[PDB]
Amino acid sequence: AGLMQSGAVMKNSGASVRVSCQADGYDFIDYVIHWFRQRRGEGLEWLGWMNPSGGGTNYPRPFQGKVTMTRDTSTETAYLDVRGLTYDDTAVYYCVRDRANGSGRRRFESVNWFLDLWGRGTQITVVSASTKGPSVFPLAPSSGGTAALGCLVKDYFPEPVTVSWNSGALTSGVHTFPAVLQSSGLYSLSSVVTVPSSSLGTQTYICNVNHKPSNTKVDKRVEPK
Amino acid sequence: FLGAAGSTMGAASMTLTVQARNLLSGTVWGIKQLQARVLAVERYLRDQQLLGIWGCSGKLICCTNVPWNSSWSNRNLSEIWDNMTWLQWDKEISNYTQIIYGLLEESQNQQEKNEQDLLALD
């Protein structure tokens, strides 16, 4: 049974979008729906609730007018709306069934609210539009723990992005970390190598990258000073 | 419950207490079991009525101021509590139940309670 969260989706600062929780396996009309949000490594947050009977809801004070959660009884579906989007709304969004509240004689009853049934969630990602080939910056070693360096690459879109070390000739001691959604609505990451201490001056190091969605390949010579 | 109707009458006499236990034990298609429970109640009450109008009413067992009739299948004392069963008896008895009832319900308490009045006065 369960619930049908629509798939993840990207949109844009400002703007607005609609998200679908389809219900199968019981009484759409009985029971009550809630919505919840987890941002980038964040304690989850309440969004709002709807009794699917008459339609009554309650938006918490800081989200009133922001959100617009609704239902269609015939389609047996729950819907949600969000407006004037900001990066601060980058997250994952669950609908969820309470059985202990709502119309109908069937009630499991609990003092605490029941979060019985869970939609899989819908990840919402606000990415300011266009694409923009990225911008690479060299992070060099310097002043023990054997030397280490890399190149970061910044404010691009969309991911992924290729980074290689001397046409990828070297792969000893390399790691290319996950992207990061900055506030700006664009991404940024970095590729790192570690090396011996005498390996500088002699052996030298550069970054190959390409963001082929923008068709932009780049070579940057990284140097500690 | 109806444990051994094939055990003889004298054996069966020991308990008459569970057949009288579960005998009540506490939309169309829903109308029906109502129509059934109601006549189960009527059968129970027809019983209790035929009972009370006899000197019986005192539940289960009840001696009576009318004896036997020869012709009503002359038999013996050990031939029935030790060698017969219940339906075994009433299938025979089918042929005389009516005037049995008739004489109980009349010639008994009616006389008996009027005679009682004749002494319930002095």
Binding site: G55, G56, T57, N58, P60, P62, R105, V111 | -
Partner: protein, 449 residues
């Protein structure tokens, strides 16, 4: 000590049975065939038959109750009944060449009503029937041309027309139990719906109750007495709607202020339709008026009666609804047959601290309901000629608490509702069904022969 039993003892427990109505006598005489729906409802015990109870206390639970849902299944049952033989409407889901209005009635009543025109079955089968009628804006819907509309229901749910002989007047009903079952009747005036109630009577024929039909606003209901009362299954649970009962009657006067005209359309045989005709004179919107300062002072005594739970000093605020269907987003109700939805927005834009005309809020009329989410069938509310005016008392309210996650900073309320069962709980708060057993045995040094 021996044993000895007793028949008629004072012992009962938590049970719930089937129960029957009671509709007294003076309702029985009004000639004209059938009433409300109480066809075989038996009249009321003309004397108050109750027994006060001495040194007894037991626990009422107004939500764990049942006779509320008894009355709920009862009323949707008789709802189905009421219309069951009434006139069908299948030839109305038809295209609708329409337009707006032609009279000096301001944008305050601009269009909204519609002057649709269309064909129809005659009495016979062959001929069509070019006709026209007038409708509230919420009965119709565009479809992608001049002005052809659809009725709202025709993509969801068929519709029957109420028999006009029916009248939508709530009448006091006495719910009365069978024997072996008793109704414990709480008789303090301070019982927040839950817990044991010391001051109690025993009763069987509960008082005459009108099943008033309204959202947010509770009409013609029962009074509280000294200190207005409020009840929640656990209000900390914001989602638990809050139900409040007044010690003070709120005057309310509603009016649909236009003189209508009726059309016995003949979609025969037998089945006759009843349409709107053109209106007499001016046109003005239905609405309601309420005494300003009485409203003021009742919401006073309320906001006084709440901070007890939320600190003697907390920030209070009210508002118009959180957005729902027209039934819950407005004061939905019936008066004189037809059906109002009142914009209760105007009576909540307020913020409350610690310890002149009169209010005119407008309502719009709709004729197409399928209430209790009972879709699959809709009811056509037939028209009424003349104007409609409506005296009512307001005695309680259904509300929603905002969940402003703080500590006890600011808490704000709005008129809740949706679930109709509360309008019953709000007069069921004071009753409990108990199964008595007349048997009870005790040891004692008594011998038989």
């Amino acid at each position: 000590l021996w044993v000895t039993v007793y028949y008629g003892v004072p012992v009962w427990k938590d049970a719930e049975t089937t129960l029957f109505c009671a509709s007294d006598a003076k309702a029985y005489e009004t000639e004209k065939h059938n009433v409300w729906a109480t066809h075989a409802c038996v009249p009321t015990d003309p004397n108050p038959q109750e027994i006060h109870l001495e040194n007894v206390t037991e626990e009422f639970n107004m939500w764990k109750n049942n006779m509320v849902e008894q009355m709920h299944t009862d009323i949707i049952s008789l709802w189905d009944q009421s219309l069951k033989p009434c006139v069908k409407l299948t030839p109305l889901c038809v295209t609708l060449q329409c337009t707006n209005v032609t009279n000096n009635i301001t944008d305050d009543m601009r269009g909204e009503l519609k002057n649709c025109s269309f064909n129809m079955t005659t009495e016979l089968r062959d001929k069509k029937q070019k006709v026209y009628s007038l409708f509230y804006r919420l009965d119709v819907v565009q479809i992608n041309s001049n002005k052809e509309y659809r009725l709202i229901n025709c993509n969801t749910s068929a519709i029957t027309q109420a028999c006009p002989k029916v009248s939508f007047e709530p009448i006091p009903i006495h719910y009365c139990a069978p024997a072996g079952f008793a109704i414990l009747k709480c008789k303090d005036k301070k019982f927040n719906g839950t817990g044991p109630c010391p001051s109690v009577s025993t009763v069987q024929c509960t008082h005459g109750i009108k099943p008033v039909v309204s959202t947010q606003l509770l009409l013609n209901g029962s009074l509280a007495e000294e200190e207005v009362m409020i009840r929640s299954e656990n209000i900390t649970n914001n989602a638990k709607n809050i139900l409040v009962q007044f010690n003070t009657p709120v005057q309310i006067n509603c009016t649909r202020p236009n003189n209508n005209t009726r059309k016995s359309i003949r979609i025969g045989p037998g089945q006759a339709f009843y349409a709107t005709g053109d209106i007499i004179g001016d046109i003005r919107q239905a609405h309601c008026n309420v005494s300003k300062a009485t409203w003021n002072e009742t919401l006073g005594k309320v906001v006084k009666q709440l901070r007890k739970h939320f600190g003697n000093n907390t920030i209070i605020r009210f508002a118009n609804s959180s957005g729902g269907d027209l039934e819950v987003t407005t004061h939905s109700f019936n008066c004189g047959g037809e059906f109002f939805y009142c914009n209760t927005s105007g009576l909540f834009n307020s913020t409350w601290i610690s310890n002149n005309d009169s209010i005119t809020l407008p309502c719009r009329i709709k004729q197409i309901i399928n209430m209790w989410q009972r879709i699959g069938q809709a009811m056509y509310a037939p028209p009424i000629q003349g104007v409609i005016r409506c005296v009512s008392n307001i005695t309680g309210l259904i509300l929603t608490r905002d969940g402003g996650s703080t500590n006890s900073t600011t808490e704000t309320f709005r008129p809740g509702g949706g679930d109709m069962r509360d309008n019953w709980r709000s007069e069921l708060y004071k009753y409990k069904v108990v199964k008595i057993e007349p048997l009870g045995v005790a040891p004692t040094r008594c011998k038989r022969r």
